[PDB]
Paper text:
We identified an IgA mAb, MAD2-6, that bound to a conserved epitope on the N-terminus of PfCSP, inhibited sporozoite invasion in vitro and reduced liver parasite burden in vivo. Crystal structures of this antibody revealed a unique mode of binding whereby two Fabs simultaneously bound either side of the target peptide. Interestingly, antibody MAD2-6 bound to a peptide P17 that covers region I (KLKQP), which is a conserved functional site in the N-terminus of PfCSP associated with cleavage prior to hepatocyte invasion. The epitope targeted by MAD2-6 contains part of the epitope targeted by 5D5 as well as up to four residues from the region I KLKQP sequence.
The interactions between each IgA Fab and their epitopes are almost identical: hydrogen bonds are made between the side chain of the first Lys in the KxxK motif and the CDR L3 backbone, and between the side chain of the second Lys and the CDR H1 and H3 backbone. Similar pairs of peptide backbone hydrogen bonds are made to the backbone of HGly96, HVal98, and HThr100 in CDR H3, as well as to the side chain of HThr100 in Fab A. Unique hydrogen bonds are also formed between LArg30 of Fab A and the Pro5 mainchain. The difference in the number of hydrogen bonds to the overlapping epitope (from K4-K11) between IgG and IgA Fabs is likely due to the higher resolution of the IgG Fab structure. Additionally, since the two copies of either MAD2-6 IgA or IgG Fabs come into close contact while simultaneously binding the peptide, they display homotypic Fab-Fab interactions, which were first observed in anti-NANP antibodies. Although both MAD2-6 IgA and IgG Fabs exhibit identical epitope conformations, peptide interactions and homotypic contacts, some differences are observed in their constant domains. Furthermore, the IgA Fab possesses two unique disulfide bonds in the constant domains. Thus, differences in the elbow region and constant domains may translate to greater rigidity in IgA Fabs, and potentially contribute to stronger binding of MAD2-6 IgA to sporozoites, along with other factors, including higher flexibility in the IgA1 hinge region and Fc differences. We expressed the antibodies in their original IgA1 or IgA2 isotype without the J-chain to allow production of monomers, which is the main IgA form in blood.
Author numbering:
A (entry chain B): 1 to 213
B (entry chain A): 1 to 225
The structure:
Amino acid sequence: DIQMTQSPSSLSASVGDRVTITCQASQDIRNYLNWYQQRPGKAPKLLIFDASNLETGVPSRFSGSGSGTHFTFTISSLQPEDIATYYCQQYGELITFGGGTNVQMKRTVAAPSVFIFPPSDEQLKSGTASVVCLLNNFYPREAKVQWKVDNALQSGNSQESVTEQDSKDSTYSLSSTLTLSKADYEKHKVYACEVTHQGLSSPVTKSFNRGEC
Amino acid sequence: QLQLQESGPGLVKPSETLSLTCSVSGESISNSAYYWAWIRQPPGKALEWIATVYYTGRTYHNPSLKSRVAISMDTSKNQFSLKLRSVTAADTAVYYCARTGIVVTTPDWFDPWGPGALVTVSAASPTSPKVFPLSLCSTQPDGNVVIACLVQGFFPQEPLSVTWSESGQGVTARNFPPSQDASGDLYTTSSQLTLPATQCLAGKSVTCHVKHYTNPSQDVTVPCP
């Protein structure tokens, strides 16, 4: 019935930035508009009730304003701990949530530490072979992990996994797993993951030859 | 303290009915002061309130789900329940129970919440992960040892938790979100343990504990370099 239009859907800001999320109600809800902060894998926690009021256990940098249809949620000085998804919620008519705003932190460029893991004996005995390439504590999030088997580009046989931005040092971690049959694994020699990232002047290649680890 | 705990199945086959129970402790749900609601959240999507129940039997419902939803309340058990019918993949979500009616005589905001229970709408049955010890073939980094556990082909993707026998000072565990396999339908992730070489001597080994779904935790021996 009443729709909350939350803008933007996501944002990136720097430490101390003034961050403002806007929630427009499709009709008047007076001040019956609340704001939630949700950490990944956790339930949302109430920060602002009744458009402007601070709930217990909420830092003073969080605030809200507005009454009627247009509402603003403000982080006056964005901290790395404040990275989360934020939702407005109205109760003027039943309960509806805004689309959400995930807030990401901007920091200085940090190159990833790269680690390659060959397939285990136990996995090879099981018929599959997985090469794992790990990237540790990098910023920005954008990172390329390119797989080469005997200098041949691998397609459709890898999977990536990026952690949530760290609430302390604002970095990311990445896992890329190239998966083959044991038959295709034993048909080749050189296995390499090439990592491309802004923090690296040139791409880093971690490689190994099959059976020599 | 007031605590809420969702209970329910991990999986419900498509078109069947999802049943969830919230166990409330530290407050009486028959009290006129508070209402009791269910909220859900599909992975990567926004929160969605479902329904609210009150001791008088009054019920509120999300208009887009009222037809498929039944919310009720057991004052003797001090529990309230949710029933969602006709579940499809669109109903795969984390389901939260929460208290509302905090300041006004009608639902206002939700506090506190339950931990949330994932419900996966799938015809598939649970697949346990095959956990494999991983040994670094790269150069070991700066006085530490890097070992890993491969957690391959499990379903559902959550709840998957990996812990290690070693922890504390000098130890950092890194976990990654489960990734859908290119193979098909199953999920794979990894866990990385960085710890001082002092703590992972040759011949010794560290144990990584992979607890998935409701099954007991798998314990796999990961040899030190």
